[PDB]
Amino acid sequence: GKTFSNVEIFDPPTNYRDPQVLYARPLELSDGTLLGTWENYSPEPPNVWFPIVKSKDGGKTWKEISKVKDTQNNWGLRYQPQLYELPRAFGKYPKGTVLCSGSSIPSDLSETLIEVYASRDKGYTWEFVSHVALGGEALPNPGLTPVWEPFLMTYKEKLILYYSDQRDNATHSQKLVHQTTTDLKKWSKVVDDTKYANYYARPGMPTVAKLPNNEYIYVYEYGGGPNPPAGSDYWFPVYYRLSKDPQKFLNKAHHQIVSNDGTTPAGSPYVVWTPYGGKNGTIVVSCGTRSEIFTNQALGDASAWKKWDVPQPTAYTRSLLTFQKDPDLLMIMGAGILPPAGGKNTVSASVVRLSEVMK
Ligand SMILES: OC[C@@H]1O[C@@H](OC[C@@H]2O/C(=N\O)[C@H](O)[C@H]2O)[C@H](O)[C@H]1O
Ligand SMILES: [Mn+2]
Ligand SMILES: [Mn+2]
Ligand SMILES: [Mn+2]
Ligand SMILES: [Mn+2]
């Protein structure tokens, strides 16, 4: 069998700094190997790194094979890792190269620097490729200028790196932006993806998936979005946009995700698409404040979102992975909650079948 529930990947030493672990991310290679990583809050020195775990049995067991380390800044690789496998070459990086992007940040949190590292041997060793984006102080407060949360995706002959940007700090508390490259070394000028006229709005945490009608779905948390629930004054509802050209989300209409029973997912979302479920496949979305998954089999029709229970617990930016050889299988991976986490975060995962979950 392929399914399992709550398999522990990593339990941190008890002396790791709160939250100890956070922000889990998985990747499936073209040979079926799985890699995984997370924010690893070790006592420094040495500078923090991103651990790389590998599974050859579809996620049932895991072993650390390497670390991605900051070789450039003497700061560490600290926040928001993202793994990606090149589906075609980009200059001297061929198809099957594994990228790890993430944010290099000094211990004192005074700067943020989105980097790209590459592995030419399926995750055993890593090399620095390029600096992408430099920002200011690594706290999510209006007026500071950090960059955060890289997400990588190919579109035709470009590689696009989507992220959150606080550097337009006189006009947007935070906005969503991207840059593109064709060689992994030179990055285009910043292009806006989503921004809101309310200064205090904080769209954040972009993820993107490709749909079978040649459209892309772009999902984010809309901080400051309308209709915050009773008692609260600011919330992070999950919104999305649809576009044929994934460099042009900025001019598209936005849509809140609300399931047919009225549930409104909020926080740190993650989207994938799988061919499972019909000609439109299934869009699957997780959010960071509840344990269910949200599905859509109508190409993002705003009235067609459903919600289903799964065994994987709620986690900040809980992530998802679809398996190429079996589109019915979905991995759900998390590394716990935002601090204070009380020493209790671990990295874990579950693999479910959508045909079983969606009954
Ligand atoms: O990854 C670690 C966390 O990141 C920092 O939050 C950054 C904000 O996260 C978002 N979603 O809630 C926004 O896009 C960013 O502004 C936080 O300090 C830390 O725990
Ligand atoms: Mn243990
Ligand atoms: Mn523990
Ligand atoms: Mn439920
Ligand atoms: Mn079964």
* CA dist 69 → 37, 64, 187, 331 (Å): 12, 14, 22, 26
Q: Position of tokens 């991103």?
A: 50
Distances (CA, A) of 309 to 6, 47, 321, 334: 14, 39, 17, 16
Q: How would you class 119 by CB atoms within 10 Å of its CB: exposed for 0-12, middle for 13-18, buried for 19 or more?
A: buried
Residue type, 314: T
Ligand 1 atom showing the smallest separation from residue 139 Cα: 18
Q: Is 111 close to ligand 1, i.e. is its CB under 6 Å away?
A: no
Provide the token pair at 42.
């070790």
The single residue listed with the structure tokens 């606080």 is 166
CA–CA gap between residue 205 and residue 285 (Å, rounded) = 13
Ligand 1 pocket, mutate which of 21, 78, 164 (most atoms under 8 A from CB): 164
Pocket test for ligand 1, best of 41, 77, 109, 149 (most atoms within 8 A of CB): 149
Instruction: Check whether 11 is labelled as a binding-site residue.
Output: yes
Question: Contact at 8 Å (CB) between 319 and 26?
Answer: yes
- The residue extents of the domains of the chain are 1-359
98 φψ region: left (φ > 0), alpha (ψ -120 to 50), beta (else): beta
Query: What separation in Å is there between the alpha carbon of 3 and the centre of ligand 5?
Result: 8
CB atoms under 10 Å from CB of 189, counted, come to 6
Architecture of domain 1-359: 6 Propeller (2.120)
Give residue 241 CA to ligand 1 midpoint distance, Å. 22
Say yes or no: CB of residue 79 within 6 Å of ligand 1. yes
Q: Phi then psi for 3, rounded to 5 degrees?
A: -90, 155
Ligand nearest to the CA of 328: 5
Residue with tokens 């995962």: 349
Asked if 206 and 238 touch (Cβ cutoff 8 Å), the reply is no
Is 324 one of the annotated binding-site residues?
yes
Spacing, Cα 194 to ligand 3 middle (Å): 38
**Residue 12 marked in a binding site:** yes
